[PDB]
Amino acid sequence: QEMEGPAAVHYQPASPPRDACVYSSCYSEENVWKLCEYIKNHDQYPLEECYAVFISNERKMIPIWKQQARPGDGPVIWDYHVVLLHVSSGGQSFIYDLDTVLPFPCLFDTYVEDAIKSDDDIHPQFRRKFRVICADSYLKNFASDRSHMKDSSGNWREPPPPYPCIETGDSKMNLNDFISMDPKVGWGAVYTLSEFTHRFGS
């Protein structure tokens, strides 16, 4: 036997269940934005406890396991993927990934163990980096005109979300500044996988 060294065993989700959330496949940056907006307006949790987390790397090829786009034990290779992180007040973190087959939400350590896995034996050009943006900053600064989702003829590669493009007073398109893992670009903090787990893991 081993006991753990606050637990949040009665943690109340910051969002509705998965199937009740606004969602479009291949627009996880917007799916997470919409979760942030829900949390802002629901007055249950301080928005500052929440973060948008972009996952990508220099070559824009990151494996993520336990993804609904590929059922089974293999990974999806994304150019980037976005999830929501809630650091609950007691210290336990939860990941909200509308594309995972893991629970929604999922304990942070379980998400890292099963969906991310170790980079130790991964070919180095697939290794994962994480850009962590305060949810308040994400709502204030993110903008996407969806121009990255069109084919060479200007038609949609994947059907867009059924509402107007997210824009701010300052920008109509800065998605590349969130996908980038250059800490001199954009908002938030950039972590390697081990830095990310060191910072938020139990």
Swiss-Prot record:
Active site: 28, 81, 97
Enzyme Commission numbers on file: 3.5.1.122
Tree of life domain: Eukaryota
EC main group: hydrolase
Compartments, as annotated in UniProt: Cytoplasm, Cytosol; Nucleus
GO molecular function annotation: protein-N-terminal asparagine amidohydrolase activity; protein-N-terminal glutamine amidohydrolase activity
Keywords: Cytoplasm, Hydrolase, Nucleus
Pfam family, one: Nt_Gln_amidase
Catalysed reactions listed for this entry: N-terminal L-glutaminyl-[protein] + H2O = N-terminal L-glutamyl-[protein] + NH4(+)
Gene Ontology biological process terms from the UniProt entry: protein modification process
InterPro entries reported for this sequence: N_Gln_amidohydro_ab_roll_sf, NTAQ1, Prot_N_Gln_amidohydro_ab_roll
GO cellular component: cytosol; nucleus
Family that this chain belongs to: Belongs to the NTAQ1 family.
PANTHER family for the chain: PROTEIN N-TERMINAL GLUTAMINE AMIDOHYDROLASE
Assembly and oligomerization: Monomer.
Function statement: Mediates the side-chain deamidation of N-terminal glutamine residues to glutamate, an important step in N-end rule pathway of protein degradation. Conversion of the resulting N-terminal glutamine to glutamate renders the protein susceptible to arginylation, polyubiquitination and degradation as specified by the N-end rule. Does not act on substrates with internal or C-terminal glutamine and does not act on non-glutamine residues in any position. Does not deaminate acetylated N-terminal glutamine.
Name of this chain's protein: Protein N-terminal glutamine amidohydrolase
Gene: NTAQ1
